[PDB]
Amino acid sequence: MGPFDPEEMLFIFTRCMEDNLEDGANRLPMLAKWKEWINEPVDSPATQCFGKCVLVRTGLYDPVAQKFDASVIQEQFKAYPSLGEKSKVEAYANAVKQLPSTNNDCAAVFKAYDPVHKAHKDTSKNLFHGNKELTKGLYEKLGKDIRQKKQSYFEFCENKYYPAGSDKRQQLCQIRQYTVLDDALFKEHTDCVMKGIRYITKDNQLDVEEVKRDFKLVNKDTKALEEVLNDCKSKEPSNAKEKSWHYYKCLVESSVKDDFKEAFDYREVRSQIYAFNLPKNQAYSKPAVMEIDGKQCP
Ligand SMILES: [Br-]
Ligand SMILES: [Br-]
Ligand SMILES: [Br-]
Ligand SMILES: [Br-]
Ligand SMILES: [Br-]
Ligand SMILES: [Br-]
Ligand SMILES: [Br-]
Ligand SMILES: [Br-]
């Protein structure tokens, strides 16, 4: 669901690498290539599924249609005119448009796209926030208005809604202790966070699989979580603005609250470096058990 900003592409690339990198000797060499948009080894199932993953998340390959979709290229260029030359973007979109219908397996999808990737590498890399120089520029222009590399997503949202130096900053003392506030500002902040860690989709829908992913990462079973979320969903408010807050509140107040806090805490840590698990997938152990900007909380 494009267009995608630099953080959104970063999320996609890092997630697809986390899910598809091999775990042995080939991990670091593979990572080093994929990071540079070198989709090799082409004969590797890991590379093939990594490539499929990225194509599916960006919408370049539609697994339901069983076809590639050049729409996202045009959407991306519309949003980021500085990131392409029209004739080159058109050439790239045309190559994708003319790919045949393709089966929804990693090998087929990867094999079909690979010639396009190679024939249009720089065009696609620039357009989808893969050019480090251009992307550095955009991050500098956006500053506080986009989550930055090496910045906790939670902190990004906190700074937006409860800025340092303001009379709002003090609320972080309660907020960071899982106090559920009721006001419009907190609902907006919670929307920022829930969407930033992908528990809520861009279209304001719950993604149960994302929540489950984080529970699993802190070594929890998810049966009770699914039961809780099913109950929460039956009481979803009609106001789209309040959906994220609704699920946050429901989780914090539920019979899975302790596991939720544990999972959410770990997610916060991992949100600070998107490539947290890339060099080697890190085992979780529960950390040892307040100040804001160095100022003690009451
Ligand atoms: Br390799
Ligand atoms: Br190769
Ligand atoms: Br996929
Ligand atoms: Br632009
Ligand atoms: Br058709
Ligand atoms: Br279920
Ligand atoms: Br990062
Ligand atoms: Br890395």
Closest CA to 162 of 171, 154, 153, 173: 171
In degrees, rounded to 5, the angle at the alpha carbon of residue 273 between the alpha carbons of residues 268 and 274 is: 95
Q: Do residues 155 and 184 both lie within one domain?
A: yes
Q: Is 133 marked within a binding site?
A: no
Dihedral sign from CA coordinates of 255, 244, 217, 48 = positive
Q: Do residues 127 and 174 both lie within one domain?
A: no
**Helix ranges, the chain (H):** 6-20, 27-34, 45-58, 71-79, 86-97, 106-119, 121-127, 132-142, 153-161, 172-175, 184-196, 208-217, 223-233, 243-252, 257-271
| CA–CA separation, 195 and 142 (whole Å) | 19
Q: Do residues 106 and 178 both lie within one domain?
A: no
Q: Is 176 marked within a binding site?
A: yes
- Are 150 and 273 a contacting pair, CB within 8 Å? yes
| CA–CA separation, 293 and 284 (whole Å) | 27
242 Cα–ligand 6 center, Å: 23
Q: Do residues 3 and 53 both lie within one domain?
A: yes
Q: Do residues 137 and 239 both lie within one domain?
A: no
| CA–CA separation, 61 and 218 (whole Å) | 32
63 Cα–ligand 3 center, Å: 8
Q: What DSSP state is assigned to residue 145? A: G
| CA–CA separation, 291 and 268 (whole Å) | 17
Closest CA to 187 of 245, 233, 240, 235: 245
52 Cα–ligand 3 center, Å: 6
| CA–CA separation, 257 and 194 (whole Å) | 16
Q: Which amino acid is at 182?
A: D
Q: Do residues 214 and 132 both lie within one domain?
A: no
Q: Are strands 67-68 and 295-296 parallel, antiparallel or unpaired?
A: unpaired
123 Cα–ligand 4 center, Å: 14
Residue where a domain terminates, one of 102, 130, 147:
147
| CA–CA separation, 189 and 131 (whole Å) | 31
| CA–CA separation, 157 and 188 (whole Å) | 9
44 Cα–ligand 6 center, Å: 34
Q: Is 37 marked within a binding site?
A: yes
| Quoted resolution (Å) | 1.7
Which residues lie at CB < 5 A from ion ligand 6? Answer: 226
190 Cα–ligand 7 center, Å: 21
Number of domains forming the structure of the chain: 2
Q: Is 57 marked within a binding site?
A: no
What residue numbers bound the domain in which 168 lies?
148-298
- Are 208 and 229 a contacting pair, CB within 8 Å? yes
Q: Is 246 marked within a binding site?
A: no
| CA–CA separation, 51 and 121 (whole Å) | 13
Q: Is 265 marked within a binding site?
A: yes
Q: How many of the other CB atoms lie within 10 Å of CB of 118?
A: 10
Ligand nearest to the CA of 43: 2
| CA–CA separation, 130 and 147 (whole Å) | 16
| CA–CA separation, 142 and 2 (whole Å) | 18
Coil, helix or strand at residue 6? helix
Q: What DSSP state is assigned to residue 291? A: E
Q: Based on C-alpha coordinates, what's the Rg of the chain?
A: 21
Q: Do residues 156 and 276 both lie within one domain?
A: yes
Q: Is 27 marked within a binding site?
A: no
- Are 28 and 62 a contacting pair, CB within 8 Å? no
Collect all residues with Cβ–Cβ distance below 8 Å to 205 and sequence separation of at least 6.
Answer: 243
Collect all residues with Cβ–Cβ distance below 8 Å to 88 and sequence separation of at least 6.
Answer: 120, 123
Q: Is 149 marked within a binding site?
A: yes
State the chain's maximal CA–CA distance in angstroms. Answer: 63
